[PDB]
Amino acid sequence: ATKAVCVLKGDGPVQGIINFEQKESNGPVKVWGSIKGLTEGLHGFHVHEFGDNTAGCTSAGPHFNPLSRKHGGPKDEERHVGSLGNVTADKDGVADVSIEDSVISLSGDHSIIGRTLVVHEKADDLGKGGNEESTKTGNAGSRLACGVIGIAQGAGGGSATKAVCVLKGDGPVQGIINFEQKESNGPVKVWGSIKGLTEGLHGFHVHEFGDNTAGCTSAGPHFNPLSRKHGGPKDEERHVGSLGNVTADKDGVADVSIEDSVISLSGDHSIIGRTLVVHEKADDLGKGGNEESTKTGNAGSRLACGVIGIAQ
Ligand SMILES: [Cu+2]
Ligand SMILES: [Cu+2]
Ligand SMILES: [Zn+2]
Ligand SMILES: [Zn+2]
C-alpha cells in the first residue's frame, strides 16, 4: 500500500500513533507522528520481524533483517532493514517523529506491513558499541511499546504462511486468532479463542484497513477488492473479508475453527496488515433483504478488533 499506520501501546505509559507514506512503489517512506509517555532523550526505534503481539512486544521477535546483515543506523550501508535509528523525546516526554527512509518499504519482500514497530527504553548506539549485543539490537534495551503496522486509507501489504491477530475493544471482548496457509493459494485455517461475548452468533470479518487509531471504527468497511455484495463464506457473491459467524458458548467463549479459500496471507487478496473484527450481532450472510445486509450483514457494532500480523 501507499499508506500505513501503527498504534503503539505497552505495559507502561508509552503510547503513540506513527504514520507511513510511500508515494512511489519503491521510493522512500515518510514516517511521522507522535509518541508520549517517554523519558526525555533518545529511544531506539525499530521494525521487528513479526506482527505477533500475543506475548506483548517480546513475540515481535528480532529486528526485521531479510539480508542477514549486522545492526546499523538508518543512513548506513551495513544495517537491518528495520533499523530506523532513534527518536528524541522532549522534556514533556513527547517524541515528534519525522523520518524519511529508503531501505524500508510498504510493498515487496522488504515490506514492513504486518510487522511490529517498537520503541525502546534506551538509545540505539547504531552498531558502534564494539561488543556483540551492539551488532544485533544496538543495546537499545526493553521494548516499551509496540504495534502491528497496518494498511491505512490509501493504496497492497505483506506476505507470510502464518499470521496472528490479537482482538481487543472498548468492552470485555478479547481474544487471539491464528491464521495458517501451508500452500500459497490453498485454504487459510483460522483458529483461536475470543472471550467476553454474549452466547450465540457473532459476525466475523476482515475489514479493509489495519487502522485502529479510532478503535475498530477506523478499520473501514469489509475488505472487498472485487467490489461484490456482502455474503456468507460459502457464496460466490461475497466480500473477500466475509468469514461468516463465530459462535460463543454459554460462558461467552467462541472457540473459532474456520477454513476459508477466498482470503489469503499473500498476493492481492492478502489480509496481512488489515483488521479482523468480531461483531455485536449475527451476520445474516447477506440474506436480510435490506441495504445493510448487502454491506455488513446487519452484524451491528464492532466489539473487538486487531491488526493481522505476520507470525510465521
Ligand atoms: Cu527494536
Ligand atoms: Cu465486520
Ligand atoms: Zn537492528
Ligand atoms: Zn462483507
Swiss-Prot record:
Cross-referenced InterPro entries: SOD-like_Cu/Zn_dom_sf, SOD_Cu/Zn_/chaperone, SOD_Cu/Zn_BS, SOD_Cu_Zn_dom
Miscellaneous note of the record: The protein (both wild-type and ALS1 variants) has a tendency to form fibrillar aggregates in the absence of the intramolecular disulfide bond or of bound zinc ions. These aggregates may have cytotoxic effects. Zinc binding promotes dimerization and stabilizes the native form.
Source superkingdom: Eukaryota
Keywords: Acetylation, Amyotrophic lateral sclerosis, Antioxidant, Copper, Cytoplasm, Disease variant, Disulfide bond, Lipoprotein, Metal-binding, Neurodegeneration, Nucleus, Oxidoreductase, Palmitate, Phosphoprotein, Ubl conjugation, Zinc
Binding site for Zn(2+): H63, H71, H80, S83, H222, H230, H239, S242
Cofactor binding notes: Binds 1 copper ion per subunit. Binds 1 zinc ion per subunit.
Function statement: Destroys radicals which are normally produced within the cells and which are toxic to biological systems.
Catalysed reaction equations from the record: 2 superoxide + 2 H(+) = H2O2 + O2
Modified residues (Phosphoserine): S98, S102, S105, S107, S257, S261, S264, S266
Pfam families, per database record: Sod_Cu
Annotated disease: Amyotrophic lateral sclerosis 1: A neurodegenerative disorder affecting upper motor neurons in the brain and lower motor neurons in the brain stem and spinal cord, resulting in fatal paralysis. Sensory abnormalities are absent. The pathologic hallmarks of the disease include pallor of the corticospinal tract due to loss of motor neurons, presence of ubiquitin-positive inclusions within surviving motor neurons, and deposition of pathologic aggregates. The etiology of amyotrophic lateral sclerosis is likely to be multifactorial, involving both genetic and environmental factors. Spastic tetraplegia and axial hypotonia, progressive: An autosomal recessive, neurologic disorder characterized by loss of motor abilities in the first year of life, after which severe, progressive spastic tetraparesis develops. Affected individuals have severe axial hypotonia, hyperekplexia, hypertonia, and myokymia, reflecting upper motor neuron involvement. Cognitive development may be affected.
Source organism of this protein record: Homo sapiens (Human)
Major localization class: cytoplasm
Residues lipid-modified (S-palmitoyl cysteine): C6, C165
TM annotation in the entry: none
EC number: 1.15.1.1
Quaternary structure and partners: Homodimer; non-disulfide-linked. Heterodimer with SOD1. The heterodimer CCS:SOD1 interacts with SLC31A1; this heterotrimer is Cu(1+)-mediated and its maintenance is regulated through SOD1 activation. Interacts with DAOA; the interaction is direct.
Name listed for the protein in its UniProt record: Superoxide dismutase [Cu-Zn]
Subcellular location: Cytoplasm; Nucleus
Modification N6-succinyllysine occurs at: K3, K9, K91, K122, K136, K162, K168, K250, K281, K295
Residues with the N-acetylalanine modification: A1, A160
Biological processes annotated in GO: action potential initiation; anterograde axonal transport; apoptotic process; auditory receptor cell stereocilium organization; cellular response to ATP; cellular response to cadmium ion; cellular response to potassium ion; determination of adult lifespan
Top EC group: oxidoreductase
